[PDB]
Design an enzyme around this catalytic site. Sequence first.
Site, PDB file in Angstrom:
ATOM      1  N   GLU A 158      19.938   4.687 104.454  1.00 36.31           N
ATOM      2  CA  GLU A 158      20.463   3.326 104.181  1.00 36.31           C
ATOM      3  C   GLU A 158      20.077   2.185 104.947  1.00 36.31           C
ATOM      4  O   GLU A 158      20.747   1.404 105.510  1.00 36.31           O
ATOM      5  CB  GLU A 158      22.107   3.763 104.169  1.00 36.31           C
ATOM      6  CG  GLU A 158      22.498   4.859 103.209  1.00 36.31           C
ATOM      7  CD  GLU A 158      24.116   5.082 102.908  1.00 36.31           C
ATOM      8  OE1 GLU A 158      24.807   4.488 104.139  1.00 36.31           O
ATOM      9  OE2 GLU A 158      24.632   5.752 102.280  1.00 36.31           O
ATOM     10  N   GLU A 290      23.703  11.067  97.731  1.00 35.85           N
ATOM     11  CA  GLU A 290      24.950  11.231  98.303  1.00 35.85           C
ATOM     12  C   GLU A 290      25.893  10.725  97.247  1.00 35.85           C
ATOM     13  O   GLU A 290      25.898   9.491  96.771  1.00 35.85           O
ATOM     14  CB  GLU A 290      25.064  10.605  99.391  1.00 35.85           C
ATOM     15  CG  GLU A 290      24.588  10.810 100.781  1.00 35.85           C
ATOM     16  CD  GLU A 290      24.841  10.179 102.158  1.00 35.85           C
ATOM     17  OE1 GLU A 290      25.767   9.450 102.127  1.00 35.85           O
ATOM     18  OE2 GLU A 290      23.839  10.234 102.983  1.00 35.85           O
TER      19      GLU A 290
END
Length: 363
Positions: A158, A290
């Site tokens: 991320e 995710e």
Amino acid sequence: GAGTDRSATQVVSDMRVGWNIGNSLDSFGQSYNFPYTSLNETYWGNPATTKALIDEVAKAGFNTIRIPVSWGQYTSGSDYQIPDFVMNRVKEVVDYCIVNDMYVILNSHHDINSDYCFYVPNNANKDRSEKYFKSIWTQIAKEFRNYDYHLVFETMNEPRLVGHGEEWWFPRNNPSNDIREAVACINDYNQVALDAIRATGGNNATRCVMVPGYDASIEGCMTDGFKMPNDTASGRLILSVHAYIPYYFALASDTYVTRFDDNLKYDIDSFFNDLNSKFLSRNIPVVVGETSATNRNNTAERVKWADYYWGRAARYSNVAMVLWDNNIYQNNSAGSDGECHMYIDRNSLQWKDPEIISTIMKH
């Protein structure tokens, strides 16, 4: 020895649903202790991954495992050398999955955090960041060069500006100058990482690779400045996106809801409509690496959530999704904590809410 002669579409199409080994090899320690000379896999309280654990996940119907790894903390010297005790263990865990005919997504995870960043998406840190990615991906790709199309590389997790006002969010259509700089930097870091992997040759010349935008969020990838890196291979790129939606139902810890209201289906709907128009309809497959809804003692609501999410995803052949699981279940009595993402208890190997699992597998 099947090689890597399959398109990103053919890989993602054969992925049904995935499971993250969360809070395991992604666990990191403090930078003043670098480099760690022993594994932090159990540092965040979770048992080391076993074949037995991966077997139960497989048996439930998952055929994809995402293995988050935080490499940086173990590296030494100017070329960020990964020690063998780390590579050997990662290979151990990858192989638990590979021998069960599963797809594996191997990444770089918490190589950025509040404590220390091995890369930063701005110009001041461009040099050391690209050096980091080139170095670790050369090493990781060589280790696993002979794995078939089941093994996918995810360049980074991320990527973001840690400790910044806009660390976790920004409006896709109005990026600040800091965000614009980050977006461009991330384009270049994905390019470097991909080039690194490709350069080791063999199966890696044509392995599928997942790449995220800023935060790996829908904003990061939908924003106009985001670019898929340039590949020498054809149709081998996959978009990585993380989407704990709807946010207040699934992840929020302050202002949250426990009910999966029909109004919230709009969040998932538009999520997919955005992905469709920009990516899926253009033959760029997307892996939702995710997603999860925190346990708020609202199992029936989370069933509705899973049913809709996976039912909605099911119409896109080139979409596959991966549950986040951090082996933490107990919430407070208000159900307010947004970090209760246990699906299988890693100590007993028992499933917590089989209704959610069964509902996912219906699609």
